[PDB]
Ligand binder design. Structure first.
Ligand code: ADN
Ligand code: ADN
Ligand code: ADN
Ligand code: ADN
Lengths: 292, 292, 292, 292
């Protein structure tokens, strides 16, 4: 009844969850950090007052971010995460039997240490001997090391000039920093912001067009995340083709992933990658490219 | 920043729209009626303080409810609407060159008169000489008249027991009243409530399962409606198959529908009818059947 | 900006405080108990989802309830509190050098234990050897014991019929139970509900009028409590006059009260007891008397 | 239930009124303008999203602003309002039989024209032959004309550097512009912002200390305004004494004011001008003076 967490999604639109408690908090120079216990969505990780991960449905975002990319790869062994302090991207990646090493590269040690203690769903992930945590800006980390990867995962905030993430979505970053760090058959996947019928023009279409300047094959896809009050997007990108059937995705899931996915089967992916009329038109007509 | 319409759309969950004004109110024996002018979604019809339709995205619901059914029919000429006092369903039907008669059978004359007075977008539709407005319970109307239809459209409220709508979702209604009023090769479509990852179990899987007990061919499908903050569902049912490629649907739309759809092309429908893993599972494993 | 406690303090009127956290909860046969940490008002005790006391301004209510009564008495030595489980009333009484015994008679042991555990400001007070805590309905306690008091203090909820408090505001209670338990020259004071320009008619004028039927001298007074968003009232009653200058009150405070009052000096009390035009009129013209 | 007007009083504090409607609006380069129909406070004039005047209680603000000043004057005939577009200050001034001319000088013609049509409580005031409306900055108007007044009334917004009002609260304005425009026995009164136990340090005490540098006799006073969620302040200032009894105020009200005041009698004024301990201490220790 009485305690509420409130979020301004758009200037004109508010989304409010009744609270059981405010469990813990932290803060860093990068962002405020909080963990709420919400009645409709259970525990919820909030960074800078924006909801990031809710207990009841974070599996949707993290399965969709991680699995398509790994499943389109013939044999993905080494993966780098840009972001991922929250730990659930690493969790889903470590469900893959083919994985030897995951590097999580988060800029904010405070998110890592907070989530490692308090998002206990990710506890085995954080303690898995295949995981290396690096506290750095993912752009400097990628630039200063020569190691190559089978999959690189963008789990960053949306591109906002002056914020710490924008540079990790430019054409130059993708071409001159990222692509050289992908092995043959390498696949890049990034979160790509809201992807609703109106909200898709904010960053999703630009992220798509940006990737399209750099990688030969670029597959945008999207899914509803109840707690975000919108459809969310992701984009796969590769110089090897990205075209597998629902059933081949399902066979690889069965063979390579420990436990059953809760959201994603191969049919769900094919649906996800078939965008609606207006969304396809936007992405196809998009001329804007992120630069700097 | 200061004026808000707020609705508790699930318990512990409020969804709030910035308000420009309250344009007109109304009432009937059945419900309170309001037309709000909202900032994020334009003019919004609210019945008993539940949002029904919002000017900026009602095209999504109405294109989805109408066009798949008619497009899957070889030559749909006459169509009966159960409910639909808001007028947009009729608007979308009347875009079809094949259609020579639309009956709108809504139990609430005040809703019809209100929307006729105040929904500018549906003025032409309400005054199309193909449209007959009938004020009656649709169950009674379908029983007492012998006329058959190529397409019957359910534009009613959700089935919750003791509602004025429950009886229009029962096996017996469908078997004994509705089906006998479909012509040979006739198609039924109904709105089917929330279709979100967890909300799809409230009524969508029951409505699907109930129609499965009466029609040979049943195709469920869903789409995000921004102003509802959920995915919403519809269900096609027929004793002839409902099976057309995306390319065939695009052709039929070009040949039969006046002007370009804003939401729906062929690939959009295919995608809509490819449900996600957990939703497909619920539907395929569902046992409840609506009866009284 | 994101976490809020909200209370509908009148119908159609919400008052919302930014929340830092929910510190502790509790419950009893009588009420839900919460200690919130709020931004504008510090720690806030909430009973059945109604704010009782807020750390930053409870001094106002408690100074106002306590000090005028004792200051108008020549030598107040023993005092009985009806209610007061929160502990601040007792805190303020025990500041008086004259006082040798305080009985706190609260019907809810859980409230007392909660506040003893969690209200740091009242720790010393709860452990003052002058204080006796009694767990009982104050009406029953006053009846079954023969001891008389110099001052009796009402720190109860408002009288609304069927409340556990109503009976403690009736003419008969005052006449038959309370007055017989005042020593010669004894003073009663009670909290008297809202005292705002329009809210003063709910209970303040009735409580004043009811006490007028039993005591020769009745002085009503009021002060703004920021966290209540209203003016609040109290009423002094005695069969000896209650009549002291501001200068005399300032002297008595300097000689009898340990440390400086934060809210109340002599001129503040004079001002508090000078009600506004419409409030004085209501009081002077009031006819309702609480009985059962 | 569903439509709400919301106001952030403090960063941490929200105050929300259920709405019947949004009646009219206007806007100017100076401020947004709206008239809401609220359930708890009736019609409400809101400028820049801050509530200014509510139907149920604006009489409190406007009686308190206007009457003390005029009633302490021996024979006030000519009055100048700085602000007053809303019309209620003029209304209350025109209830005085001694008044020959009222000049309302508002910077924003749009407030004047809006309120003249839509705040019909002020309609006789706006049409009274004794009222002259001037559209100007009150500082330029006062500076460029030689006419002197018996009473000058500040009905402006709070002093905020860079806003259009700050200059009308400086020492230099008061000494070199205002005082020369007051006749012998002239009295200045200004609204002086919030005056609550904590909120009084924002502008009230500074406005008091500022006036104290310029006028020999300065009387601060305050009253609760339910719709503002706080105690509001005003300050009288004169080089002739300001010291009348409750009863002399009452006799002058009876003789000179048409109709009965609803809020103010002379006792209410004496109470109003007796500030509480902490408020008096603040005002007396205040060293800050508004300059420029
Ligand atoms: N440049 C960056 N490199 C790595 N992680 C980042 C960067 N910017 C933001 N993040 C992390 O991304 C996550 C999502 O915002 C957060 O954990 C945040 O700390
Ligand atoms: N039994 C019914 N027959 C026809 N229309 C109905 C019935 N019950 C509700 N409606 C209409 O359905 C629409 C959606 O609730 C409303 O316009 C309502 O009037
Ligand atoms: N009849 C009563 N006797 C004593 N205390 C009471 C009674 N009813 C309520 N209270 C106490 O009054 C306080 C204020 O409501 C609470 O602590 C409550 O427990
Ligand atoms: N400098 C000024 N002179 C006159 N009126 C003003 C000035 N600044 C603000 N106002 C008016 O004061 C009123 C209260 O904010 C509004 O009607 C506004 O237009």
């Amino acid at each position: 009844k009485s305690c509420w967490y409130e979020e301004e999604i758009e200037e004109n639109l508010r989304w409010c969850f009744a609270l059981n408690s405010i469990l813990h908090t932290g803060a860093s120079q990068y962002q405020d950090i909080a963990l709420l216990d919400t009645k409709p969505f259970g525990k919820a990780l909030v960074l800078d007052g924006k909801l990031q991960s809710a207990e009841t449905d974070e599996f949707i975002y993290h399965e969709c971010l991680v699995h398509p990319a790994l499943l389109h790869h013939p044999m993905p062994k080494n993966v780098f995460i840009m972001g991922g302090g929250e730990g659930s991207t690493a969790r889903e990646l470590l469900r893959h039997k083919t994985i030897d090493k995951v590097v999580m590269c988060d800029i904010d040690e405070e998110v890592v240490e907070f989530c490692k203690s308090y998002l206990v769903v990710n506890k085995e992930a954080f303690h898995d001997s295949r995981l290396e945590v690096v506290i750095n800006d993912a752009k400097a980390e990628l630039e200063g090391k020569e190691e190559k990867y089978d999959v690189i995962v963008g789990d960053l905030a949306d591109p906002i000039e002056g914020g710490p993430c924008y540079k990790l979505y430019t054409k130059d970053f993708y071409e001159l920093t990222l692509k050289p760090k992908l092995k043959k058959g390498g696949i890049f996947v990034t979160q790509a912001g809201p992807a609703g019928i109106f909200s898709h023009t904010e960053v999703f279409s630009c992220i798509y067009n940006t990737l399209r300047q750099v990688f030969k094959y670029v597959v945008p896809y999207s899914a509803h995340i109840p707690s975000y009050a919108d459809i969310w997007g992701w984009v796969l990108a590769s110089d090897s083709p990205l075209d597998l059937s629902a059933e081949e995705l399902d066979i690889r899931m069965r063979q390579r992933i420990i436990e059953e996915n809760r959201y994603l089967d191969g049919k769900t992916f094919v649906s996800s990658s078939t965008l609606s009329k207006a969304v396809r038109n936007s992405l196809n007509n998009e001329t804007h490219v992120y630069t700097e």
